[PDB]
Short mmCIF file of C-alpha atoms and ligand atoms in Angstrom, two decimals:
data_model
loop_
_atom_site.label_atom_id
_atom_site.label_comp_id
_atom_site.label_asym_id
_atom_site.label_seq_id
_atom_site.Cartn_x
_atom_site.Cartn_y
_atom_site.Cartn_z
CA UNK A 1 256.43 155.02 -86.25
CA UNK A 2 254.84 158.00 -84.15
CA UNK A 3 253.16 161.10 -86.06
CA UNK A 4 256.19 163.37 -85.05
CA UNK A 5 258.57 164.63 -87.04
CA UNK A 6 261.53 162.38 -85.91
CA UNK A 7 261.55 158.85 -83.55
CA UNK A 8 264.56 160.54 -82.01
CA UNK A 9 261.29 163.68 -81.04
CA UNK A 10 259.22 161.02 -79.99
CA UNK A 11 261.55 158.85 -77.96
CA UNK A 12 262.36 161.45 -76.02
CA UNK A 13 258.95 162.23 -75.08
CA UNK A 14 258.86 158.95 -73.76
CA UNK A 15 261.76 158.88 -71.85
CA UNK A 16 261.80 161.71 -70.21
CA UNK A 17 257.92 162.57 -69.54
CA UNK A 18 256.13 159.17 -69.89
CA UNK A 19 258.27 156.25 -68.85
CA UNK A 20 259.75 157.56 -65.23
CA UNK A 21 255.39 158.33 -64.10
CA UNK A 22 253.94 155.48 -65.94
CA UNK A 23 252.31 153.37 -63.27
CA UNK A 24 253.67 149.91 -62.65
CA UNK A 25 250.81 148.06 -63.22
CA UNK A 26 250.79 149.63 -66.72
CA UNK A 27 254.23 148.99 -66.83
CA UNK A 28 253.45 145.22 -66.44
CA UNK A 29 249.90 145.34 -68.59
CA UNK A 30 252.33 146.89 -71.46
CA UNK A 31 254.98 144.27 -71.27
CA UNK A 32 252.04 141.09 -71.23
CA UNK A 33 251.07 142.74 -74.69
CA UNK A 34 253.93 143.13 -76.87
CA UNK A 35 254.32 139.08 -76.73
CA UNK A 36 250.64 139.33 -78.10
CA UNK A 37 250.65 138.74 -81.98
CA UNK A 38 247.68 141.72 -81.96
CA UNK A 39 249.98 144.07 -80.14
CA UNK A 40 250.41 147.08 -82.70
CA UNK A 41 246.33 147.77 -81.60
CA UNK A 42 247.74 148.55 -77.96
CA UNK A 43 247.50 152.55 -76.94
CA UNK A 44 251.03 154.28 -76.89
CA UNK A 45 252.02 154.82 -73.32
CA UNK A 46 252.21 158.33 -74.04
CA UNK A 47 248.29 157.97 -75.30
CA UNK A 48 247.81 155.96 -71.79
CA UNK A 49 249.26 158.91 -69.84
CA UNK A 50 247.15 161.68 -71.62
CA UNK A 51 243.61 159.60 -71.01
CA UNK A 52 244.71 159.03 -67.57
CA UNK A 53 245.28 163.11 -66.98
CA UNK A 54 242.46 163.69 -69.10
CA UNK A 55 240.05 161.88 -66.47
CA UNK A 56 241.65 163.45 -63.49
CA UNK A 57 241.02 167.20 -65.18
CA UNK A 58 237.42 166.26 -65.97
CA UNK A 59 236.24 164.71 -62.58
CA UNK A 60 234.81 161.91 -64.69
CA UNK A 61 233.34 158.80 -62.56
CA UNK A 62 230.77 156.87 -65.05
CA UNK A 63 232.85 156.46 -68.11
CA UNK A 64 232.24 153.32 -71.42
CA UNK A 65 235.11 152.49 -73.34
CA UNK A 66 234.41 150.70 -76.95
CA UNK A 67 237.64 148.61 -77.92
CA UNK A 68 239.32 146.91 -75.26
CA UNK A 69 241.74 144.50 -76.20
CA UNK A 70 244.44 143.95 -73.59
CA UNK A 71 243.20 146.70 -71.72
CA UNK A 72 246.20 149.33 -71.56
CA UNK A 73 243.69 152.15 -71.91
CA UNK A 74 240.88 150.52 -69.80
CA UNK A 75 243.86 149.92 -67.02
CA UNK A 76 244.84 154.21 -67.56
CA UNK A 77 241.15 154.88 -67.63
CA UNK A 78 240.47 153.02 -64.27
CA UNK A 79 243.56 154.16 -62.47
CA UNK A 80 242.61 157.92 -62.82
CA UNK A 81 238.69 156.91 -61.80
CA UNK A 82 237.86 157.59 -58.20
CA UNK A 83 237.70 154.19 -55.88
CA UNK A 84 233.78 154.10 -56.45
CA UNK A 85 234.41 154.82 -60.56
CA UNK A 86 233.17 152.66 -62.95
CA UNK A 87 233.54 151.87 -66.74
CA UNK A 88 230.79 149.90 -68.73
CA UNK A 89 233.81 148.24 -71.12
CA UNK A 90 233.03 146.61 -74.67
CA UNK A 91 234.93 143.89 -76.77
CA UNK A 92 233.51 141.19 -79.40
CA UNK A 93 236.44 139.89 -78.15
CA UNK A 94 237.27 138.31 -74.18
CA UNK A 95 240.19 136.36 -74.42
CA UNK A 96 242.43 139.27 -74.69
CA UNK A 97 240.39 141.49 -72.02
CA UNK A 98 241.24 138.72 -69.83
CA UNK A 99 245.34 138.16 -71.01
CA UNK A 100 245.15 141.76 -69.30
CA UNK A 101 242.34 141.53 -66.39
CA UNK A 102 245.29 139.93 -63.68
CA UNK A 103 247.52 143.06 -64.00
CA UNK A 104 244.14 145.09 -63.34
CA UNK A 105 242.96 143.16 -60.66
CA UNK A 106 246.66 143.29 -58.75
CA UNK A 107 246.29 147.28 -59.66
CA UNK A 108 243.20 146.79 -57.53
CA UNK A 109 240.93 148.76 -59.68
CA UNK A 110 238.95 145.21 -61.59
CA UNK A 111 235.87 146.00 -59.46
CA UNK A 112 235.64 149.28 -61.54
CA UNK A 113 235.32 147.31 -64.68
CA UNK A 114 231.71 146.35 -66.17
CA UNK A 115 233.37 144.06 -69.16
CA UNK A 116 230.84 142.99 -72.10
CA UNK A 117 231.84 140.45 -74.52
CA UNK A 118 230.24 141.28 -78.13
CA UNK A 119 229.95 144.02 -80.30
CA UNK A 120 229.34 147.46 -78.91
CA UNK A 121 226.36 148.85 -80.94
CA UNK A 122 223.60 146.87 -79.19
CA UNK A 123 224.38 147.30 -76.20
CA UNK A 124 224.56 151.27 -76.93
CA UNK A 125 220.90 150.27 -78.09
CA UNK A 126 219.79 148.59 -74.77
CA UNK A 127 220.86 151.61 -72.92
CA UNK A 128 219.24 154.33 -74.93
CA UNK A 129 215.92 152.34 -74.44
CA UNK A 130 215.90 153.01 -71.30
CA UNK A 131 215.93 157.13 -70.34
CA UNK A 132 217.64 156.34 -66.92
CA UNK A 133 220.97 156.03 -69.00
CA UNK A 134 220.24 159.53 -70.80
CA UNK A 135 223.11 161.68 -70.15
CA UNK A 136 224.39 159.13 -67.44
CA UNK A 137 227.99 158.75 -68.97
CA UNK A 138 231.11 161.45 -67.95
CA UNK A 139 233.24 159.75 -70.58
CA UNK A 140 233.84 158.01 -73.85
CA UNK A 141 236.68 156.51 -75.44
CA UNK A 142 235.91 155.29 -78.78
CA UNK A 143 238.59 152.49 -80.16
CA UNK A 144 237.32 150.07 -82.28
CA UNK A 145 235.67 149.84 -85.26
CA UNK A 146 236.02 152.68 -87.69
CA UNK A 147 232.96 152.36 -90.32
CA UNK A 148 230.80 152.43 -87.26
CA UNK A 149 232.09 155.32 -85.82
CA UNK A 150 229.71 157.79 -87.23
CA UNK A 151 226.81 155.14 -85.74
CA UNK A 152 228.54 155.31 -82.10
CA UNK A 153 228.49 159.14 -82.49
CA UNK A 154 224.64 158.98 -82.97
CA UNK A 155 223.93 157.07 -80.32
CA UNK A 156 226.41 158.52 -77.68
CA UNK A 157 225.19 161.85 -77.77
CA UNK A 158 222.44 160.69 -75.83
CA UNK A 159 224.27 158.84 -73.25
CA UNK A 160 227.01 161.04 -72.26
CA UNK A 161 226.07 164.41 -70.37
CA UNK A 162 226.12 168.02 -71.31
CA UNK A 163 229.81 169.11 -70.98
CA UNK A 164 230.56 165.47 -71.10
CA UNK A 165 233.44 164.32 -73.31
CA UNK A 166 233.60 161.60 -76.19
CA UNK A 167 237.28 160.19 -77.27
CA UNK A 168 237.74 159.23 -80.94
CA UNK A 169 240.75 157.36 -81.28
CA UNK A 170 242.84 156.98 -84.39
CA UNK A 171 241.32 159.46 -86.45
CA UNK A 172 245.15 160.39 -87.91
CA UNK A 173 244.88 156.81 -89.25
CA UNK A 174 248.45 156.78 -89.72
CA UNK A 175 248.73 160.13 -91.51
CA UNK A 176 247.23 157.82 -94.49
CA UNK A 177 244.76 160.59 -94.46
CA UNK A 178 247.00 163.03 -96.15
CA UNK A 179 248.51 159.94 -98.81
CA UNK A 180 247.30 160.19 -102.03
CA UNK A 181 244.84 157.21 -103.22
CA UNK A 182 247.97 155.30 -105.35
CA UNK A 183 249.79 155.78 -102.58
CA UNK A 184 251.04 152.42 -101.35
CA UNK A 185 248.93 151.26 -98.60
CA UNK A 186 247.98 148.24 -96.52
CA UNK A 187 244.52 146.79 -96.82
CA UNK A 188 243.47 147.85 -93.88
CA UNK A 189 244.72 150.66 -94.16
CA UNK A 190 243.14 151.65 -97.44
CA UNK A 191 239.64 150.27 -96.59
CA UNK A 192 239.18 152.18 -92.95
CA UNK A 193 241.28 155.31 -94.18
CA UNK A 194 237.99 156.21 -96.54
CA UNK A 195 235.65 155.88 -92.81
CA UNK A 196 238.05 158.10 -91.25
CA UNK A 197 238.41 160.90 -93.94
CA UNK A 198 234.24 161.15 -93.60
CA UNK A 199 234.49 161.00 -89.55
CA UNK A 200 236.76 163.74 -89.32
CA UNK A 201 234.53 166.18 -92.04
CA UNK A 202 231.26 165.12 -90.02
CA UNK A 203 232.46 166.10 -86.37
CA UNK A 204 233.84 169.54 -87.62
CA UNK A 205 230.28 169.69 -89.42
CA UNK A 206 228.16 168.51 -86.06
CA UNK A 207 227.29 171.59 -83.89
CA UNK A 208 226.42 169.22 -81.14
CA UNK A 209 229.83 168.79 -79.74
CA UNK A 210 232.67 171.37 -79.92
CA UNK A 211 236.07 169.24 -81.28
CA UNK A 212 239.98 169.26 -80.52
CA UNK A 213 241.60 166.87 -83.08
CA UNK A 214 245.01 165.95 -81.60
CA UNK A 215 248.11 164.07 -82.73
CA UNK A 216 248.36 161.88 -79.85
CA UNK A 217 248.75 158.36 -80.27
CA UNK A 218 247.73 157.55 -83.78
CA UNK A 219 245.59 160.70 -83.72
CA UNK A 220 242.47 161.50 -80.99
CA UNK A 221 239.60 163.62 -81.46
CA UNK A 222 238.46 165.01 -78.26
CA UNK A 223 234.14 165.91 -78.50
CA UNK A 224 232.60 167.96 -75.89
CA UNK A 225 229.02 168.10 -75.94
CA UNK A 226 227.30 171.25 -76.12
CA UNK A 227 223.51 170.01 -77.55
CA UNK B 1 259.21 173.25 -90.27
CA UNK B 2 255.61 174.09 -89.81
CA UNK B 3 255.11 171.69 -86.84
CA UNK B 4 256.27 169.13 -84.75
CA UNK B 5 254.59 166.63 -87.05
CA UNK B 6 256.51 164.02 -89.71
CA UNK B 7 254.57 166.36 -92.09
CA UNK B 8 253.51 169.10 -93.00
CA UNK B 9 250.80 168.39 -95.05
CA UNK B 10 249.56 166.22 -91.87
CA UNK B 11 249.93 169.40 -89.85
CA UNK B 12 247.77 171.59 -92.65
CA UNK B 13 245.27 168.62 -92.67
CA UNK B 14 244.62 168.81 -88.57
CA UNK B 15 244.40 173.11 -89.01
CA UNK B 16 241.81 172.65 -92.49
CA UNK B 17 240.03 170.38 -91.04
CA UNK B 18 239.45 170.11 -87.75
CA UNK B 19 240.71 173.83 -86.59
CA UNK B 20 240.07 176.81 -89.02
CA UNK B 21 236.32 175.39 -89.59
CA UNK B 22 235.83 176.03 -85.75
CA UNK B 23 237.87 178.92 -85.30
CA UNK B 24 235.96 182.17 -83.47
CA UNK B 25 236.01 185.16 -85.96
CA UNK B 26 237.66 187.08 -83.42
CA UNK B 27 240.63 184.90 -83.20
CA UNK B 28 240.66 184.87 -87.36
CA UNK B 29 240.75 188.51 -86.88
CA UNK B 30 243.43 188.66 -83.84
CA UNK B 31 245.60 186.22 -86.17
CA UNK B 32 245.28 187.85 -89.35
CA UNK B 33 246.26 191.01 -87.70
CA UNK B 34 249.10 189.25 -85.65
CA UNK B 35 250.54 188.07 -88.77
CA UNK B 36 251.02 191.46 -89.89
CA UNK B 37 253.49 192.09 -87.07
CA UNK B 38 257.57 191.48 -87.32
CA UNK B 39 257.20 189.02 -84.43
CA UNK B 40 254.25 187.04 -85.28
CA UNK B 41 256.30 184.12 -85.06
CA UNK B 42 255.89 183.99 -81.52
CA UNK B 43 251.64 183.62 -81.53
CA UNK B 44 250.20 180.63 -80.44
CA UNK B 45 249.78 178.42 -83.42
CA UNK B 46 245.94 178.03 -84.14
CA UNK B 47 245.73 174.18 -83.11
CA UNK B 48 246.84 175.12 -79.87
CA UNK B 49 244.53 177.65 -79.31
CA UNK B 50 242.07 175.29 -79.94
CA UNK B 51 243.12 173.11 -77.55
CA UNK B 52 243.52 175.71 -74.69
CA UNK B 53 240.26 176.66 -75.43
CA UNK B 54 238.36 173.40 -74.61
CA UNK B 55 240.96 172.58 -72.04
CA UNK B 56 239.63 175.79 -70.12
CA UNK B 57 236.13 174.38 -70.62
CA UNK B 58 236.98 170.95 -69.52
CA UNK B 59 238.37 171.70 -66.14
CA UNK B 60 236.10 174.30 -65.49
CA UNK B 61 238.54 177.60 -64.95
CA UNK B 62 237.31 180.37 -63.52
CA UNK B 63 240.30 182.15 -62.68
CA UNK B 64 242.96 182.05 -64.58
CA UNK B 65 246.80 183.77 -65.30
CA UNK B 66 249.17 184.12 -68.30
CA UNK B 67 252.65 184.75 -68.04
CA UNK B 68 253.92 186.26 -71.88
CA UNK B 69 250.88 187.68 -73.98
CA UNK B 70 252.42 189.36 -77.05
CA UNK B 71 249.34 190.17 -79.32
CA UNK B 72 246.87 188.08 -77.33
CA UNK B 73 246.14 184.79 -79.27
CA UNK B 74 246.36 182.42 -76.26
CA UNK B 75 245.02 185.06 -74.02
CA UNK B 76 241.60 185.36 -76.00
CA UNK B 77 241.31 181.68 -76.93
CA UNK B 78 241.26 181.73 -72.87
CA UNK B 79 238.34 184.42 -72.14
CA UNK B 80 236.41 183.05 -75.03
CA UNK B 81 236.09 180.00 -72.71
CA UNK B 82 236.40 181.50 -69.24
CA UNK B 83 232.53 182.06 -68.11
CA UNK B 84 231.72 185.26 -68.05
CA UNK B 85 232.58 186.43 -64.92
CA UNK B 86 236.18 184.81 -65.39
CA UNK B 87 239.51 186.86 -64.73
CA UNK B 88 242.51 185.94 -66.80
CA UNK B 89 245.83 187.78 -64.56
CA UNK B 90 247.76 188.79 -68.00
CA UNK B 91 251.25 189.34 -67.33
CA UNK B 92 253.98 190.98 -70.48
CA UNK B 93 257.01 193.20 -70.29
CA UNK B 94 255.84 194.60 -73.80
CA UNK B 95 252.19 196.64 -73.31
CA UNK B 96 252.05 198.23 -76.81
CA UNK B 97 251.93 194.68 -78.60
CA UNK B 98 248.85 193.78 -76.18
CA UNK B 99 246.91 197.05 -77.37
CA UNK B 100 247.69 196.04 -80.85
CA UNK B 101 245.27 193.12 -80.27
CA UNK B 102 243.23 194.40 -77.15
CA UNK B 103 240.68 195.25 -79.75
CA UNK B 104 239.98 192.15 -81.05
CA UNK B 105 239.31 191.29 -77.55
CA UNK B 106 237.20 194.11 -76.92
CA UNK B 107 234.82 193.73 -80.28
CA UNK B 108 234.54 189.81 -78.96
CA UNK B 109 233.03 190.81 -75.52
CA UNK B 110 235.55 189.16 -73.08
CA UNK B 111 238.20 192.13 -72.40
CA UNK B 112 236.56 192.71 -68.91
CA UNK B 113 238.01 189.88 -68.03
CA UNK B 114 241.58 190.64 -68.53
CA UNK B 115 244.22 192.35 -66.08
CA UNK B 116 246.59 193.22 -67.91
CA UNK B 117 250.17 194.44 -65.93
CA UNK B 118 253.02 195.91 -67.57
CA UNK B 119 256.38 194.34 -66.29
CA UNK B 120 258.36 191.15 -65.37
CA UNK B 121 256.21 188.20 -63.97
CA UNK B 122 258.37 187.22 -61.29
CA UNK B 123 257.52 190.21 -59.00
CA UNK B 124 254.24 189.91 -59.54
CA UNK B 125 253.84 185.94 -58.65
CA UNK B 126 256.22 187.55 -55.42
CA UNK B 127 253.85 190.26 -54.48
CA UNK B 128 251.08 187.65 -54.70
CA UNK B 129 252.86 185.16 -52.48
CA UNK B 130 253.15 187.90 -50.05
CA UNK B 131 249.26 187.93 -49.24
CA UNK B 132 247.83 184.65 -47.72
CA UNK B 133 244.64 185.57 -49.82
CA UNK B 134 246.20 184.45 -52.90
CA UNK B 135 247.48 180.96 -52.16
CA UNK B 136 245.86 178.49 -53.69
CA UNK B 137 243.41 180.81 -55.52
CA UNK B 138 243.97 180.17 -59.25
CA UNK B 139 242.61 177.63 -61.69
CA UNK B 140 244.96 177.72 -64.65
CA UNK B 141 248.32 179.28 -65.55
CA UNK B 142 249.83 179.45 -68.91
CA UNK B 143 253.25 180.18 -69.27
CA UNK B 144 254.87 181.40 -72.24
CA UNK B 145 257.25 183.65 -71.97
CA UNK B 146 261.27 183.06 -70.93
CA UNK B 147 262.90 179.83 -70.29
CA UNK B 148 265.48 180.87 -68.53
CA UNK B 149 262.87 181.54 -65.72
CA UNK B 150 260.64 178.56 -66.06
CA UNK B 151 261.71 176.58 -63.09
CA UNK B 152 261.77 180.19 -60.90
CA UNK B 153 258.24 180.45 -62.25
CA UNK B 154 256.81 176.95 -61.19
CA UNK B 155 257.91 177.15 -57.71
CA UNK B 156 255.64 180.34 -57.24
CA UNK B 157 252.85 179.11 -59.04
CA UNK B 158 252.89 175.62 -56.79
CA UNK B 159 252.04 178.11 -53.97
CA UNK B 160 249.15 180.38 -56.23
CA UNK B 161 247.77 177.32 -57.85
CA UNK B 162 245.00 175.40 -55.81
CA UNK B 163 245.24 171.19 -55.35
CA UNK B 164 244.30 169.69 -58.51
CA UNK B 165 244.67 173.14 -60.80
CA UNK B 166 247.13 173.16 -63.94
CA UNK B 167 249.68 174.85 -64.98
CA UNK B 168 250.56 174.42 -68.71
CA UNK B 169 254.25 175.74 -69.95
CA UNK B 170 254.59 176.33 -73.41
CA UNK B 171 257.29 175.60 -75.66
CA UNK B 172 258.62 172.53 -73.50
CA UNK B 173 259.91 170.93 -77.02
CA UNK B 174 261.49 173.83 -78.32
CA UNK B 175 261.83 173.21 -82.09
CA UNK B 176 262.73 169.59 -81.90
CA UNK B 177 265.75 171.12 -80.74
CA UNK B 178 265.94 168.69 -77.66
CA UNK B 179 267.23 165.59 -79.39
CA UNK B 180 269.74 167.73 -81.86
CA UNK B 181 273.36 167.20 -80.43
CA UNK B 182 274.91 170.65 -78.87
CA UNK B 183 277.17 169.92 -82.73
CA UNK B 184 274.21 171.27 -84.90
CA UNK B 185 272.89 173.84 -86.20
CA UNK B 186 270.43 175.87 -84.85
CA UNK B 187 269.18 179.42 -84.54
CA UNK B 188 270.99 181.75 -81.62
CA UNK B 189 267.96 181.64 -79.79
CA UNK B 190 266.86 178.13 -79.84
CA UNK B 191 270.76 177.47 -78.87
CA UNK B 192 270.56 179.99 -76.09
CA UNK B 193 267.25 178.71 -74.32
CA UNK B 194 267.72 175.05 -75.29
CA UNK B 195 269.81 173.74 -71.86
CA UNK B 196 267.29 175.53 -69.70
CA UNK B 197 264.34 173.79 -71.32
CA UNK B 198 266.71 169.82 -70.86
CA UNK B 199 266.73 170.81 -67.63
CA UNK B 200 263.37 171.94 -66.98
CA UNK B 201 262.08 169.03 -68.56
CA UNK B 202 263.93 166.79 -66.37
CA UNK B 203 262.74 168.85 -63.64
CA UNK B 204 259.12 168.69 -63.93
CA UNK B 205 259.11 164.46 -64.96
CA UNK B 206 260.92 164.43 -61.07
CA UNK B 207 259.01 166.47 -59.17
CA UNK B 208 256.39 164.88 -57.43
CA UNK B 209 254.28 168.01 -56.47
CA UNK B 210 252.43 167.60 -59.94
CA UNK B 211 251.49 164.66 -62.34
CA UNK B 212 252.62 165.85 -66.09
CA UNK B 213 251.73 165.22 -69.53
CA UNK B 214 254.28 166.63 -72.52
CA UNK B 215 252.29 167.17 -75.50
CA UNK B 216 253.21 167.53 -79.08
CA UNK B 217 250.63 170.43 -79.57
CA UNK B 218 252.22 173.86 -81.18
CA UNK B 219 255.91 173.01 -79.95
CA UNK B 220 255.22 170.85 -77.15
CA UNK B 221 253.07 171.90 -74.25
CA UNK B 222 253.78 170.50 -70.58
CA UNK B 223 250.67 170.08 -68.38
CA UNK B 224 251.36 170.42 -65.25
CA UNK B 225 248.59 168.86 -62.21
CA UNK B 226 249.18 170.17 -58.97
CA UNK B 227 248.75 167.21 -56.67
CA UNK B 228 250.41 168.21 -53.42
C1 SAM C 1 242.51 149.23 -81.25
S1 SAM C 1 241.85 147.79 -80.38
C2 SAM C 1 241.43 148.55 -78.80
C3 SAM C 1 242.70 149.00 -78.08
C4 SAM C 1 242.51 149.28 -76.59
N1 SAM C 1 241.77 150.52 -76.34
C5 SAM C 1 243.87 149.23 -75.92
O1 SAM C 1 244.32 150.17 -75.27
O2 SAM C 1 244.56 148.21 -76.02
C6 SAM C 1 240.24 147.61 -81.21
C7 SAM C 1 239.32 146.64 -80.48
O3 SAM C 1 237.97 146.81 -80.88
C8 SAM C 1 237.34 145.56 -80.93
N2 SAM C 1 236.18 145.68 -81.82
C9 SAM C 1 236.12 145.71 -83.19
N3 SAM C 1 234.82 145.86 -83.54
C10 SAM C 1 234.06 145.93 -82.42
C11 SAM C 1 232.71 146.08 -82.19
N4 SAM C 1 231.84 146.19 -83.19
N5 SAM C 1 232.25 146.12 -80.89
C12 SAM C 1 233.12 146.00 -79.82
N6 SAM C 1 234.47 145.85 -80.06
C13 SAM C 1 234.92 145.82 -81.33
C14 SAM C 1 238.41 144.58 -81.38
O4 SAM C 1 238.12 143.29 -80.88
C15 SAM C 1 239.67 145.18 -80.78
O5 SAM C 1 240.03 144.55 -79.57
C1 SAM C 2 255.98 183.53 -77.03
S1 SAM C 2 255.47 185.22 -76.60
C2 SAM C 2 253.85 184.90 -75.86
C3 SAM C 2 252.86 184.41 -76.92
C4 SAM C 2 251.39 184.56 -76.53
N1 SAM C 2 251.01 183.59 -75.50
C5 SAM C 2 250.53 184.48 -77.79
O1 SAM C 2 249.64 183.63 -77.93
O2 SAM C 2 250.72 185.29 -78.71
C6 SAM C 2 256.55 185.49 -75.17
C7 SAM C 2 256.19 186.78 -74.44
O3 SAM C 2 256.78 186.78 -73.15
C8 SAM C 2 257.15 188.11 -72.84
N2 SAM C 2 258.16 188.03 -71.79
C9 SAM C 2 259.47 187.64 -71.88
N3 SAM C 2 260.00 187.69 -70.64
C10 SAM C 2 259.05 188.10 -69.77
C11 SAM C 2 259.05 188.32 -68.39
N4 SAM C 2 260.14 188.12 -67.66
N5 SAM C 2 257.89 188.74 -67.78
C12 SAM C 2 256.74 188.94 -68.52
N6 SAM C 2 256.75 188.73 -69.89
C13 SAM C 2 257.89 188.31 -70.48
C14 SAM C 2 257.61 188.72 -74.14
O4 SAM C 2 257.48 190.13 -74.12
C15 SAM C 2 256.69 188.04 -75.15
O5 SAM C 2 255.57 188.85 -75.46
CA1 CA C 3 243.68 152.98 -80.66
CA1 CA C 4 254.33 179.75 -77.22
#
């Protein structure tokens, strides 16, 4: 399942570091989901409890997140915010923001929470045209779409600060990355696994952000930018 | 074996792509040299010395302290990112394999930053403790060096760390060894050290004086927040 070398490796990780801190709220948010038919697209408690650090060790306060579903990394993300935090969140989809949105609200960190329904890359567009939002962002976690990826990239660079940080998630893709092409592999698999192989060569290639490619989760590339 | 990861080729993927492309030449040069040596098994793998590196830059370290430098890999991925008027406290019972790489660090313009003491850590973190100054004063500790003094070593660094700095301890996953039953094989020194880390593990997910994170970087890295 994981990208370790053994479920035993992984389990433990869980048990014994993730599980006994992981907030109840999440808890409860993570439990809601797995009855969800869509619930393999949920971020790994362990992911959940590295963004949630991750914010607390940047200072971040005006974060986005692209991809919400259910909202287990939203609810991480908005936990670790200060009180007066926000996060501009995007989703073609509402439905299952708002399957999740009680177990934030009882968490009492909803009012953080700027949720638009419908797909991410014009509202990136709305903000850019104004230069209020340049540089205005702390944070980024990127979890949606992968063939637009590259297209996010472009236009986040201008939104998030100097020194800010951008999160690409899923950019191990399974480990499908290092499969041959006859290898076996779902559709899905197959048809974003060619968008990911290109992501990953064009952020070690782009000198505006320096990069940290870890095998958290289903893979995350961390992007600080420098330019 | 390479890596924690289910493969290697996985593992080789992450360094050719995403690590040895953005690798400083000095830390190509430290490595190649390091590799040389009868213990290079004991450098910090290049991912994580990527990692440590932005890590520094992300919570904005100033002053910083290692505990177990061998030929410096960690160290210098650490005063690359430090600004330039950042002190790294380096702390080994071995000085001769530090000078082996102290020119790397030299040629790459960040050795001023290093102070480098011969000797155990533990007297050092005590002689630190003993001067009010001190408390609360550092940014970031990274500790790699014995397990059998890990927990010793995080009760004096709660006191040298300040509110909301991190302490990272290295090797928290120790081969995979942690989920192998006491039955199986394993090296003498994976066997010897392996209890201590179960325990230390434990440990730090119950103590409330810091919020964690276990990561499968190198062979498992434990950040450690200090929140009280
Ligand atoms: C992997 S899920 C997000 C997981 C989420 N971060 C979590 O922790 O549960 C991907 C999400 O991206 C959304 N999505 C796909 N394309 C999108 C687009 N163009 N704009 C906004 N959201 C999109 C999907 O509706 C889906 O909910
Ligand atoms: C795993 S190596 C450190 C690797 C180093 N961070 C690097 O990147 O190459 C462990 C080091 O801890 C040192 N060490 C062991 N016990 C120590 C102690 N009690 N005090 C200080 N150093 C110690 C050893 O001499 C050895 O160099
Ligand atoms: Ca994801
Ligand atoms: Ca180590």
């Amino acid at each position: 399942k994981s990208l370790l070398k053994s479920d035993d490796l992984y389990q433990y990780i869980l048990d014994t570091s993730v599980y006994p801190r992981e907030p109840e709220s999440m808890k409860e948010l993570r439990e809601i989901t797995a009855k969800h038919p869509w619930n393999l697209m949920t971020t790994s408690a362990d992911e959940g409890q590295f963004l949630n650090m991750l914010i607390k060790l940047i200072g971040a306060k005006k974060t986005m997140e692209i991809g919400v579903y259910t909202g287990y990394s939203l609810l991480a993300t908005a936990l670790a915010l200060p009180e007066d935090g926000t996060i501009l969140a995007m989703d073609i989809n509402r439905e299952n923001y708002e399957l999740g949105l009680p177990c934030i609200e009882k968490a009492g960190v909803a009012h953080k929470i700027d949720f638009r329904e419908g797909p991410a890359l014009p509202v990136l567009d709305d903000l850019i045209a104004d230069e209020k939002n340049h540089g205005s962002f702390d944070f980024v976690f990127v979890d949606a779409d992968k063939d637009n990826y590259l297209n996010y990239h472009d236009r986040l660079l201008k939104l998030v600060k100097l020194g800010g940080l951008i999160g690409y998630d899923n950019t191990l893709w399974n480990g499908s990355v290092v499969l041959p092409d006859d290898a076996p592999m779902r559709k899905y698999i197959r048809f974003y696994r060619d968008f990911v192989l290109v992501l990953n060569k064009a952020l070690a290639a782009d000198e505006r952000v320096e990069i940290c490619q870890l095998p958290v989760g289903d893979g995350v590339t961390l992007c600080r930018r420098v330019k």
